[PDB]
Scaffold this active site. Structure first.
Site, PDB file in Angstrom:
ATOM      1  N   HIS A 113     -56.541 -32.613 -16.478  1.00  0.00           N
ATOM      2  CA  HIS A 113     -57.902 -32.500 -15.959  1.00  0.00           C
ATOM      3  C   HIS A 113     -58.921 -32.970 -16.992  1.00  0.00           C
ATOM      4  CE1 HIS A 113     -61.291 -30.783 -13.686  1.00  0.00           C
ATOM      5  NE2 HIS A 113     -61.757 -30.423 -14.869  1.00  0.00           N
ATOM      6  N   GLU A 114     -58.838 -32.413 -18.198  1.00  0.00           N
ATOM      7  CA  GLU A 114     -59.764 -32.762 -19.270  1.00  0.00           C
ATOM      8  C   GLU A 114     -59.690 -34.235 -19.674  1.00  0.00           C
ATOM      9  OE1 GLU A 114     -62.162 -30.864 -19.982  1.00  0.00           O
ATOM     10  OE2 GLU A 114     -61.331 -29.123 -18.943  1.00  0.00           O
ATOM     11  N   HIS A 117     -61.682 -36.419 -17.606  1.00  0.00           N
ATOM     12  CA  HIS A 117     -63.073 -36.473 -18.051  1.00  0.00           C
ATOM     13  C   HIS A 117     -63.189 -37.376 -19.273  1.00  0.00           C
ATOM     14  CE1 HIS A 117     -64.382 -33.469 -15.287  1.00  0.00           C
ATOM     15  NE2 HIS A 117     -63.906 -32.419 -15.931  1.00  0.00           N
ATOM     16  N   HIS A 123     -65.921 -34.625 -11.280  1.00  0.00           N
ATOM     17  CA  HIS A 123     -65.245 -33.737 -10.340  1.00  0.00           C
ATOM     18  C   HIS A 123     -65.226 -34.238  -8.902  1.00  0.00           C
ATOM     19  CE1 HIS A 123     -66.076 -30.138 -13.220  1.00  0.00           C
ATOM     20  NE2 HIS A 123     -64.901 -30.688 -13.468  1.00  0.00           N
TER      21      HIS A 123
END
Ligand code: DEO
Ligand code: CA
Ligand code: CA
Ligand code: CA
Ligand code: ZN
Ligand code: ZN
Length: 159
Positions: A113-114, A117, A123
Site C-alpha cells: 500500500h505504502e 504511494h 487512494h
C-alpha cells in the site's frame, strides 16, 4: 500527480523493527516492491549503503518529517509521493506490532500500500484495491492487486 521520471528505482531500509526477524522484514519489503515491478517496467534495487530513492524507516511518534505517528492503532504508516529528498520515503509506525501474518499489522500488505504511494498512487474507492484507504488483512500467499490498482500504476508507468 508526481511520478518517478525513470524506471530504475532504488530503496534502502534504514532500520529494523524489533517486532520481526531481520530477514522477514527484508523479505516483506522485497516482496511488496515486486508486486509493483511485476505489472510495470519499473525495476527496484535494494542498497545497503549510500543514497536511495525510497527510504524505509520504522519509527514512533515524531521522527523528523513533521508528521508524527500516533501510537498503537490509527495511522499505521505513511509515505511521500515521488520527489527529491523525503519524496518516496515509506515510514512505519513502530507503535504497531509488525508481523509476517495475522498476529498483528502485516508488514507486507502495509508495504504494498505504502509503496503504491511512494510510486505516486493515491487512494481508490474500489474496496478490492490495495490502494483503498482502509487497511485490510488477507492471506498474503494469495494476495493480488485489483484491476483498479493495475490500471492506476500502468497509466503512470506503462506496461
Ligand atoms: C489487500 C490489502 O489491502 C490493503 C489496503 C490498505 C492498507 C493500508 C495500510 C496502511 C494505512 C495507513 O497507515 C494510513 C496512511 C495515512 C496517511 N496517508 C499517506 O501516507 C498518504 C499518501 C498518499 C495519499 C494519501 C495518504 C494518506 O492519507 C495511508 O493511507 O498510507 C492505510 C491502508 C493495507 C492493505
Ligand atoms: Ca499508529
Ligand atoms: Ca526519497
Ligand atoms: Ca513495534
Ligand atoms: Zn514519517
Ligand atoms: Zn494510503
Amino acid at each position: 500527480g508526481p511520478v518517478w521520471r525513470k524506471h530504475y528505482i532504488t530503496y534502502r531500509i534504514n532500520n529494523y523493527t524489533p517486532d520481526m526477524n531481520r530477514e522477514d522484514v527484508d523479505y516483506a519489503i522485497r516482496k511488496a516492491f515486486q508486486v509493483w515491478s511485476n505489472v510495470t517496467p519499473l525495476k527496484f534495487s535494494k542498497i545497503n549503503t549510500g543514497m536511495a530513492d525510497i527510504l524505509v524507516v520504522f519509527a514512533r511518534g515524531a521522527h523528523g518529517d513533521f508528521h508524527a505517528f500516533d501510537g498503537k492503532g490509527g495511522i499505521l504508516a505513511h509515505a511521500f509521493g515521488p520527489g527529491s529528498g523525503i519524496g518516496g520515503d515509506a515510514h512505519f509506525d513502530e507503535d504497531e506490532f509488525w508481523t509476517t501474518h495475522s498476529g498483528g499489522t502485516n508488514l507486507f500488505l502495509t508495504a504494498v500500500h505504502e509503496i503504491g504511494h511512494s510510486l505516486g498512487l493515491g487512494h481508490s474507492s474500489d474496496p478490492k484495491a490495495v490502494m483503498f484507504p482502509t487497511y485490510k488483512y488477507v492471506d498474503i500467499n494469495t494476495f493480488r492487486l485489483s484491476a483498479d490498482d493495475i490500471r492506476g500504476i500502468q497509466s503512470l508507468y506503462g506496461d
